[PDB]
Design a protein around this ligand. Structure first.
Ligand SMILES: COc1ccc([C@@H](NC(=O)C2=CCC(=O)N=C2)C(=O)Nc2ccc(C(C)C)cc2)cc1
Ligand code: NA
Lengths: 251, 12
């Protein structure tokens, strides 16, 4: 069904690198150059206070929407990814349900400024104090710490492209029907990532990459904080949360 | 259900 579902040669690994980098460039949602230029555009003390004064349900809804929009670009990235559309519909859904949020969390490090510990949110850069109305400081601080540790790696766009393809194409996801097909696809993508790192003398980042349990823990904490919000405002989730968000994180 | 996800995946 696809070349990368079997053993690939060096030349085909080289093509896979260009393919993944292209798929990512066309689906990155926000341009890195726009994110870097906006670093000086920081929310005022008055603006931060206005966000803190917002109700919990309103902040949750704003955040669920922005996350949902980011996930749509991840779905488009998956669709352009070599071998993804050749997998069955069950496996594509399994891979996106388990991995879309993890891909968004990795993509996030581009919108995060380690110099002043601020993130790009609704047109400007703000610290974690901007999300105080959410009432999930542990999850927010954990996301900020994770983006801070990824920022220290100084990832290029090509490295993000390749690493993020691997976050998504994970053959160990429970519920995969064609596990062997996913395994071979993951192997070729592992080779493509390691090949590009070898070529750019960036193999030193391999030991510095976050453990796979770190991304799973963040996702499990997200689903947990959602359930606590759901108990407090069930009609807010049912009526105002994006349908795509509920499909991935509620059930 | 996976209504939205199926639709996004099918929409070519
Ligand atoms: C692809 O990477 C990003 C995607 C979106 C954003 C931010 N976008 C917006 O705030 C936004 C504004 C208006 C709109 O219509 N759509 C999105 C974004 O979502 N920021 C963000 C940052 C941190 C968090 C959590 C820590 C709560 C959540 C959202 C940042 C990086
Ligand atoms: Na960063």
């Amino acid at each position: 069904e696809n070349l990368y579902f079997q053993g690939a040669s060096l030349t085909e690994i080289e093509h896979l690198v260009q393919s993944v980098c292209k798929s990512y460039r066309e689906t990155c949602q926000l341009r890195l150059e726009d994110l870097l230029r906006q670093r000086s555009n920081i929310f005022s003390r008055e603006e931060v206070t206005g966000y803190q004064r917002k109700s919990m349900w309103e902040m949750w809804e704003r955040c669920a929407h922005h996350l949902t929009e980011a996930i749509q670009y991840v779905v488009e990235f998956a669709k352009r990814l070599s071998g993804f559309m050749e997998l069955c519909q069950n496996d594509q859904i399994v891979l996106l349900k388990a991995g879309a949020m993890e891909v968004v969390l990795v993509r996030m490090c581009r919108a995060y400024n380690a110099d002043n510990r601020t993130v790009f949110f609704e047109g400007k850069y703000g610290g974690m104090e901007l999300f105080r109305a959410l009432g999930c400081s542990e999850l927010i601080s954990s996301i900020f710490d994770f983006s801070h540790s990824l920022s220290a790696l100084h990832f290029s766009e090509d490295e993000i492209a390749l690493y993020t393809a691997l976050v998504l194409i994970n053959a160990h996801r429970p519920g995969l029907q064609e596990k062997r097909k996913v395994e071979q696809l993951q192997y070729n993508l592992e080779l493509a990532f390691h090949h590009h790192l070898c070529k750019t003398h960036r193999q030193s980042i391999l030991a510095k990459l976050p453990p796979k349990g770190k991304l799973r823990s963040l996702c499990s904490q997200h689903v947990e904080r959602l359930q606590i919000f759901q108990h407090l405002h069930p009609i807010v989730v049912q009526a105002a949360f994006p349908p795509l968000y509920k499909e991935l994180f509620s059930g | 259900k996976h209504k939205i996800l199926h639709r996004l995946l099918q929409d070519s």
